[PDB]
Amino acid sequence: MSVGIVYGDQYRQLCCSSPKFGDRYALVMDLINAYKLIPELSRVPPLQWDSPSRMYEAVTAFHSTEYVDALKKLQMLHCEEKELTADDELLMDSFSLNYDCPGFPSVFDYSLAAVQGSLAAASALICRHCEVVINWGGGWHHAKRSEASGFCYLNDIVLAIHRLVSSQTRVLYVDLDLHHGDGVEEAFWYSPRVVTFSVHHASPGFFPGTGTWNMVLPIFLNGAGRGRFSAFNLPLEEGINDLDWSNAIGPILDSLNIVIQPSYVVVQCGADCLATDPHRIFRLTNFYPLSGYLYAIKKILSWKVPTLILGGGGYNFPDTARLWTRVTALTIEEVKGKKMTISPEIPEHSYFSRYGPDFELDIDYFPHKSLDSIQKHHRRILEQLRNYADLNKLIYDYDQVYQLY
Ligand SMILES: [K+]
Ligand SMILES: [K+]
Ligand SMILES: [Zn+2]
């Protein structure tokens, strides 16, 4: 019944301290506040640690000591306004702490804050304080063991899932971001207990290039060892709309829930599939009568499985706030059974000016038409799900699953 959301004063400051995402988190939490949702939500405080040793122990559950050390040293150098020595440039380069993942004065505290948020969110599900927890400061799916990638420095998702599986525990991870959830997929590549499902754009030279047919004829990789068939991917061509994306993923989600019977669901809800994201690749909306995002979240919540909802990508800050406000309101409705009426007019607040010139909740887009490739992927995914079920000796109505598709 209880819906948790991660916020706090320091957390807000840190989530708003990065050059790439600026004040997006402030717009998200202030639009949620403006629509009077905060009293319906349980504040989940970010996790803090008893010592540096305890913080390091927690982060190095996934990340390497040398990577965490390099990330902490990058923050120190950007704070002293020290020019990096040639030696320091090579160190940072070795961890990809450069180009799209640059240093900045708060890079470690900013990155860690996401981990603090998503770990606290996982704990609140484990002790059953909340049935769903939202962290709009998390979702950094690209970060690897020893590599920064796609403005992801620490993988708050991997650390949250590790806490859930450590708490027979199975986790279904659903990645709705425009980009492939490569970092989360890789971390659990060998585990049958964490099934990863990413739906994303893939095309030649599009970041990160995984989650699709790869040269090793190209083959579709899907995990290894005990984790064989446990990594699911739906790559989609540009231009897909709400209905087609919904019809593409809906049967996959329902089939994974039926076969896996997850103890926890973790959803990455990156907003860069919106028609108005500057990426301009997918044509998803935040519309509610239907938004692909809201269709997906409503389906996942209907399973009544303890669920972690995270952010991620989303480069139109006002449209990201607009979508994540509706996801939050939908979450309250579905979990609490309490209808939350949201005025189509953006309420007056701190950031009202940023919603111009229309100042409406619906993103300013008129959907039109975007099927063949989806059917091929459906046959391949249904096949892979059977192989996953067979390998792990899982019992399920094959016909019931076939019928979803
Ligand atoms: K994705
Ligand atoms: K896996
Ligand atoms: Zn993205």
Hey, where are the domains in the chain? Answer: 1-405
Work out whether the CA dihedral 79, 45, 57, 143 comes out positive or negative: negative
Q: Amino acid identity of 9?
A: D
Is 100 annotated as contributing to ligand binding?
no
Look up 63 and say whether it is catalytic. Answer: no
* Terminal CA-CA length for the chain: 31
Give the Cα separation of 48 and 197 in Å (integer): 30
Q: How far is the CA of 189 from the centre of ligand 2 (A)?
A: 4
Q: Is 397 annotated as a binding residue?
A: no
Q: Say which ligand is closest to the CA of 202.
A: 1
Distance 192 CA to ligand 2 centre (A): 5
Furthest-apart CA atoms within the chain: distance in Å: 64
Residue 283 DSSP class: B
Which ligand is nearest to the Cα of residue 172, counting in written order? 2
Catalytic residue (choose from 142, 180, 201, 377)? 142
CA gap 87, 90 in Å, rounded: 5
Neighbours of 293 (CB within 10 A): 28
Q: List 264's β-bridge partners, or say none.
A: 171
Is 179 annotated to bind a ligand? Reply is yes
* Four-residue CA torsion sign, 195, 198, 204, 209: negative
- Ligand 1 centroid from CA 177, angstroms: 4
Radius of gyration over every alpha carbon of the chain, rounded to an integer in angstroms? 20
The experimental technique used to determine this model is X-ray
Distances from the Cα of 385 to the Cα of 225, 264, 381, angstroms:
16, 18, 6
The resolution, in Å, is 1.9
**CA–centroid distance, residue 51 to ligand 1 (Å):** 35
- Answer yes or no: are the C-beta atoms of 271 and 314 closer than 8 Å: yes
Cα–Cα separations (whole angstroms), residue 309 to 19, 68, 269, 305: 24, 25, 7, 12
Q: Are 39 and 5 in contact (CB under 8 A)?
A: no
Instruction: Give the closest residue to 263 by CA, choosing from 228, 311, 302, 303.
Output: 303
